[PDB]
Sequence to fold (433 residues):
Amino acid sequence: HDQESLRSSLLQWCYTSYGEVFSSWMHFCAVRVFAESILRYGLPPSFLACVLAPSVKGEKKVRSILEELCG
Amino acid sequence: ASRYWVVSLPVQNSAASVWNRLQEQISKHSFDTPLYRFNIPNLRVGTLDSLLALSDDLVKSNSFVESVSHKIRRQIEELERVSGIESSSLSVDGVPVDTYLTRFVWDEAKYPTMSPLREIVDGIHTLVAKIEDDLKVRVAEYNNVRSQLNAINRKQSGSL
Amino acid sequence: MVRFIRQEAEEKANEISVSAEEEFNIEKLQLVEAEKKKIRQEYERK
Amino acid sequence: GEFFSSALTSAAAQQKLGFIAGLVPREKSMSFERMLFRATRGNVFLRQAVVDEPVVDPVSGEKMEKNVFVVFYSGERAKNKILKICDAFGANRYPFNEEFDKQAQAISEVSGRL
Amino acid sequence: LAAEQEAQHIVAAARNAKMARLRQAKEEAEREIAEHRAQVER
Fold:
């Protein structure tokens, strides 16, 4: 019963920590936006990219649009 | 879970119909692409050498993010009772995935210092490492509880 | 590109110079404190 | 030394930086542009040869299409990767003086020694 | 180039002129010490 509670209550705190880790990953993505801005533009942070989880067709269309800055 | 899937384009290299059209009114609406973003620049940026150092450290930052994602997707889900935290409950920077991915408001004073991010990135990485360490401590506690599980009751039911 | 590097170099030099000037002011305050202490000592001796 | 008038003009047109003097073979054009994008970032300028003559290897006289080139490094942090890229190029690489006359004199002295 | 001129004597001039601010701090320190000494002597 204690193991089940830990998987339900202590692991509820683990899920809260997972949400905090998701927040940290969002902050990391925010930092990476400025990192890419510095890498492919001037030093000051300014980005016009986007973050999502699109389908293959949408990613292909985005790459076709952005082929002016292809890798 | 899902690994990183963010696109790479500066302000001067917007792929939308207009430079400011990345957030909305882009051709992505026609293709139903869920892409969204909102600017949140830092107070200042480092030099060229600082930029190169940050780019080098971005690999370690991505590795740490991947480790945190793997831990969150494995330890919580495997317990069969910890995956109850939905996207709203696990909202990134206080906003769900619909809004968290549409803005960079996480660059506020919580993980970074709202300042030149050359060391603020390392500080936020250390904070994320501490969070992952807490998650690993919880996973170890769950493992010890499972060790407490499958106890002497696992033997025969008597007369055996 | 190079103009942004120019601003960073000037900003770093400006901040360093201001910090050095503030440190020199603090050192001067400590120096006048020591001078006042030794002046008090010599006045007490006199 | 040829880059002391070509690469310098290219950098002036494109504009603290490092010296990426060395070499890059005729087949290193892709690696100079497609690769090392993080370090170069597109703000650097370079002058390269097309291996007009077979340049002998630094430890071999058999020679190949080992063109020599001089570029600008985007700081020491980027110069760390620039040195690795130049090593991957593997052509007849040797640093020279910044001055065009001094670089030409060094080239003449090395040719006389050879 | 422009970057070379930026990293040129333009910044080293201020780096060396920080000695002027240091000298001003020393001068004001000496003036304050002399004023305090005059006051206590009086």
In short: The two ends of chain E are 62 Å apart (CA to CA). Chain E has two helices and no strands. The helical segments of chain E are 2-6, 9-41. Chain E touches chain C at residues 1-3, 6-7, 10-11, 14-15, 17-18, 21-22, 25-26, 28-29, 32-33, 36-37, 40-41 (CB under 8 Å).
